[PDB]
Structure 1
Amino acid sequence: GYCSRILRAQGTRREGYTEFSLRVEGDPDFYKPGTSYRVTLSAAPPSYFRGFTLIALREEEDHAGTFQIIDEEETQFMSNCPVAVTESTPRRRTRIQVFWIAPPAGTGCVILKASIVQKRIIYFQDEGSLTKKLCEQD
């Protein structure tokens, strides 16, 4: 896209299931328009991350719901790409969380995508454990 290009500039592609996981609490099968979901990004022990990004896109542009910050000490909108969420400061973390408010009916499938930096290498993928797709109910 455009934010995507910025977010991937220094990136190492690692597809599939990895020690870093993007999940939605309650493991929903689909989204309901306008519902808020708690999205989490975490490291399996003893791993951690120092930085991340998180973006939602339409299956690709950006009328893809709305993030809402839960923890201002740990996370913020990225000024470079205001629709994306990112760390407030580099520091070792094992979990971050945010709200995502599902878009209006007729939007179609949304893909939530996270990138992760632990030390120097920035990891991203198109599919796997940093990727969560949710569609409207069949």
Structure 2
Amino acid sequence: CSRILRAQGTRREGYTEFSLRVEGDPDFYKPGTSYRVTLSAAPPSYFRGFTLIALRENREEEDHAGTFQIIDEEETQFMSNCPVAVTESTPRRRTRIQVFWIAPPAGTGCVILKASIVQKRIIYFQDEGSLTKKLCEQ
């Protein structure tokens, strides 16, 4: 599929009012361990849609680390447009979203989880910042 899935995006680098983080906040990952990933929207702010992927550091095809597992089928789904991505299942307002992610085999290096966010019309995305989480193996 594509990260060219973006054609209507506004790039917004840095820390924003939207945050992608992992519950427990691990400094490092452990191959085959299932971490809970959450996408959050701070004080009087909300989102209506999003996307989510994982990638090995430095890599920009089939270079996606680990696998996602759906927790809330009323909120999330795998995108039939891009199967390696997790996205919203309804454009209804949310302040939180959660998904499982399972750590890739021993010695896969560093992994970045990236999210994009649509609030009203605008789709926001970035390479570095609060919608981005890098996790390494050691």
Common fold: TM-score over 0.5: yes
Instruction: Give distance in 1, aligned partners of 2:89 and 2:101.
Output: 18
| CA displacement, residues 66-119 of structure 1 (integer Å, 9 cap, x when unaligned) | 000000000000001101000001000000000000000121111000000001
Deviation at 1:60, TM superposition (A): 7.4
- Matches of residues 29-108 of structure 1 in structure 2 within 5 Å? 29-57=27-55, 61-108=62-109
SS at match of 1:86: strand
Instruction: Give distance in 2, aligned partners of 1:69 and 1:30.
Output: 22
- Percent identity reads 100
Instruction: Give distance in 2, aligned partners of 1:43 and 1:7.
Output: 23
Confirm or deny: 8 A CA contact 1:39 1:97 kept in the other structure: yes
Confirm or deny: 8 A CA contact 1:67 1:98 kept in the other structure: yes
Confirm or deny: 8 A CA contact 1:11 1:123 kept in the other structure: yes
Which ranges in structure 1 are unaligned for 5 or more consecutive residues?
Answer: none
Confirm or deny: 8 A CA contact 2:2 2:82 kept in the other structure: no
Confirm or deny: 8 A CA contact 1:59 1:110 kept in the other structure: no
SS at match of 2:92: coil
- The TM-score with structure 2 as length reference comes to 0.93
Instruction: Give distance in 1, aligned partners of 2:52 and 2:63.
Output: 13
- Of stretches 38-47 and 58-67 in structure 1, the one that deviates more from structure 2 is 58-67
Shift in alpha-carbon separation, 1:61–1:110, aligned structure 2, 3 A: farther
Instruction: Give distance in 2, aligned partners of 1:34 and 1:80.
Output: 26
SS at match of 2:137: coil
**Structure with the higher strand share, 1 or 2:** 1
Aligned-CA RMSD value? 1.4
- Matches of residues 4-23 of structure 1 in structure 2 within 5 Å? 4-23=2-21
Give the total of aligned pairs.
135
